[PDB]
Amino acid sequence: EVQLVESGGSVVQPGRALRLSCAASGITFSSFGMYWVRQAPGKGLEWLGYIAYDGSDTYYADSVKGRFTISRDNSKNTLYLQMNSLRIEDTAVYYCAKDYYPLLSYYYGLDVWGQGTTVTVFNQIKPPSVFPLAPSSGGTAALGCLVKDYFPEPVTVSWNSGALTSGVHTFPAVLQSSGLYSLSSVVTVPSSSLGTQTYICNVNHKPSNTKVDKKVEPK
Amino acid sequence: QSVLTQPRSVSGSPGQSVTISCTGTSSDVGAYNYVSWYQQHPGKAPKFMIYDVDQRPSGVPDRFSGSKSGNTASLIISGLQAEDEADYYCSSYAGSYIWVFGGGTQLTVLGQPKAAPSVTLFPPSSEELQANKATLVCLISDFYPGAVTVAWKADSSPVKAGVETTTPSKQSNNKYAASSYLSLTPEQWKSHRSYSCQVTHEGSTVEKTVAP
Amino acid sequence: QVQLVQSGAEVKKPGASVKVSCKASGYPFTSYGISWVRQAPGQGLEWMGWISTYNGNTNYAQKFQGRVTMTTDTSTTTGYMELRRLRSDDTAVYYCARDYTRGAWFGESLIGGFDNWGQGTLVTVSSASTKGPSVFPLAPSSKSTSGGTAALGCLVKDYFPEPVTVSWNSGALTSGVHTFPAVLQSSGLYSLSSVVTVPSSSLGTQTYICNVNHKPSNTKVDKKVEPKSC
């Protein structure tokens, strides 16, 4: 069956331009109108646009009409998304998909999709701020570390340099409206061991080469 | 043309029927019979499931069917199987050679008993207030199905601005975890008697309250 | 209103042709084709063909291909049906009817039927020569061996072509009369009977005369049927 492979996604600064590729196996590409669809992390599908099989027409969602350009090279079996003046809103997975039917078709559906290519738009690299989340004393107490305002992913969090494992819960990160990430790692701990065992979280943001330690003490 | 409105989540048990609604306007779903449906599994591309409101492309089981009534289209899945746990989007022509996707519907096929969430709420750390910021951290764990509505309150009035909530992730024990955060000014944090993180799950609210 | 009037009865020798005519009136002639159906005596309907009054196109039943020709004349709003090389089993009544089963202009099939019909044309194909009937008595016995009800009659034998009419006592005796349909004998001549049942007690005093008329030969026969006393 025909296979679509998107390429070209990258971490890019807002305002730059980026051209995505989408390469189809075999020779079936010349017969089909192609589409672009995007999906922001945890958000729904957004129909972007279409170019006809022969290039006769190109259509565009209003949200990107005039800023994105769709084109194709039937010689090279490849479809293109030219993205201009990139915004924070453009961070997403970018899909190319083939019309269910060849030639002028359009009224039915998109039946073969590629695997996607990821575009992430933020200004610069930011290491996190780490803040301690203090416990307040079932005999169980929760303490943790807030890893605030970083880009890009990922951060890894250990507790007491590896010795503390059971009880720790490192939550997935939120993606903020700004483009920065934050997460938290909590550890559930016996209440009687506060102030005798010291609790240190080790935050490691390899994209900025920064390790931070933070001791967490009862407040 | 505006998003098509789908319920955020819906659930049914194996062998039962569930219907996902998809309401648009007179200039899309109510205008045309070019209404289509897509199925998307975690980390996968969408799969094409319905077109012309109720026709099925090659290799899609008859237990998937559609219908349309006024400005609302429906997707109906009878005899639910476990493979059907996925997100479902409707899709509609909007005139002038434009297509529009609906919001998306998380279908969970029940495989274990309902689990309520447990909520841990952290106040802003003392260190962060000294840096002139404030973040309320609301931690949500061990619920099923993996869908919640999080709401914040300053004293009793609902807080809309400064909320950031993750999309639930499947834990190791196949319950779900999620987090919400409230971004705040030291002064506004201190000007209330209490803040309150309110998680709703299958129509039942767990609440956690924190005071300056 | 709509009306189609056909030509009169025809007797034809085997081998000859017959041409029946069909005069239409009370509707726009060139909008409807004309269809033709025959019915041998005592039998069902047999389709013959169709013709457009707008352009002369014809559609004939396979059975009559080569022997039938159908025609229309637009100024006299009349349709014609010619059948050639007549054999004996072409003896039938021939009907025309206004067609709404195939269109006159385009010759394609329509949601309708043969809606107005002509009164029919009898066509007798025979070698027989015109002949008046012999009338013979069916005499009652003046010895009554069947309750008090006696049957008596006229045997009207060996005449051609159809029809004869039979009355009794010049139309004054009517109740109880049965004039049977004629039969075609293997001589080629038609033959029939007319009977009537009467009180046995009335034979002595009532006079029973059958009156047999046969216009093709200009022959009327009046026969007094008397009781056979032997």
Add this chain to the structure above:
Amino acid sequence: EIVLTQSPGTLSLSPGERATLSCRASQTVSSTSLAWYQQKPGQAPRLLIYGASSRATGIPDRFSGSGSGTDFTLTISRLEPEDFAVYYCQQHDTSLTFGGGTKVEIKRTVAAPSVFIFPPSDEQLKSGTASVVCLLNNFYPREAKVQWKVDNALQSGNSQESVTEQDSKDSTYSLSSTLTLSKADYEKHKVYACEVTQGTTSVTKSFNRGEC
């Protein structure tokens, strides 16, 4: 050829009863191309129904038609005396063919024929032929087996029959059977016998040649 079979051959019903006439087709006949005609004796056929269910103008609404595929029905919901006639169905889906007809006659209480036998008139004998006439007067039902025996020898192929139409007053039939012999053969034998059978009853009426 699309062959049309109508059943039963004869339908015996009473005034006011319901008439259900069948027309079956050896292949599919489109409902657009099926028609019913009525033909009373001595008159031309009249169109009743065209297109399976459409009534021709002027036709009483007690006539209706239905069916599709290969099965078509004509219904006379309430039989008036005018309705007792023959009925033909007709198709022009492919070429054009007729049914064989169904006769709808008046059902009445059974009536035994009053039977008479007539020797040849002597007037006729002088001419060289003998017509022996057997009369079955005013009987019901129509079905009736008439046999000729001569000196107890059963005859075949030398008689002919004629039946009246159903009577306007008593709904009966009369029938004649005419036996034709040469004057030579008529005079060679003695006992002339007409044997009328319907059901479990045969009635033979006879005479002896010359005998008073």
Add this chain to the structure above:
Amino acid sequence: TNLCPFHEVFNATTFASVYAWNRKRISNCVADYSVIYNFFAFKCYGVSPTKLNDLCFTNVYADSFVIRGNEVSQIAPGQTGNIADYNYKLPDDFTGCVIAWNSNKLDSKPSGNYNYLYRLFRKSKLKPFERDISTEIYQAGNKPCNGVAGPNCYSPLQSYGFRPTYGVGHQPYRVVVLSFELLHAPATVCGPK
């Protein structure tokens, strides 16, 4: 003195599939468009039916076919869609009438009447009154097709499946499109005169 054979197209037993739509030419006849004034649904663009009896034309064209009820709205000037793009196109400057009536009793059956086809896709949109009767299976890949659908081999036509229990928008509709043409020749189709 010949009446126009409009009744022959309206009362035909048989309508064409829309992809292979039927055209009758009508000429040299008296027309009575009171017929079109008489459960039918008519829409005239450019003329009024009562005024049509005061006009003469060189020819009149009657195009007929069957489509789905919810597709009838595509038989109108300036429209676009499944049927108008690929099956039957009216010109934007259309002078004429569209008549459509529900034909469920005639064109549906419980097992599905599949005898009406329509076109799914095309190398370009249809021009006004263009008729494309191609049925050759579109070959998309290197392998030949041989009249039958398969992988990379697409039938361009699909049957309607008409059943009488379907909703109105999915049960069959018969439709006739009357064009009125006038050109550099004498006008033969006049009205009741």
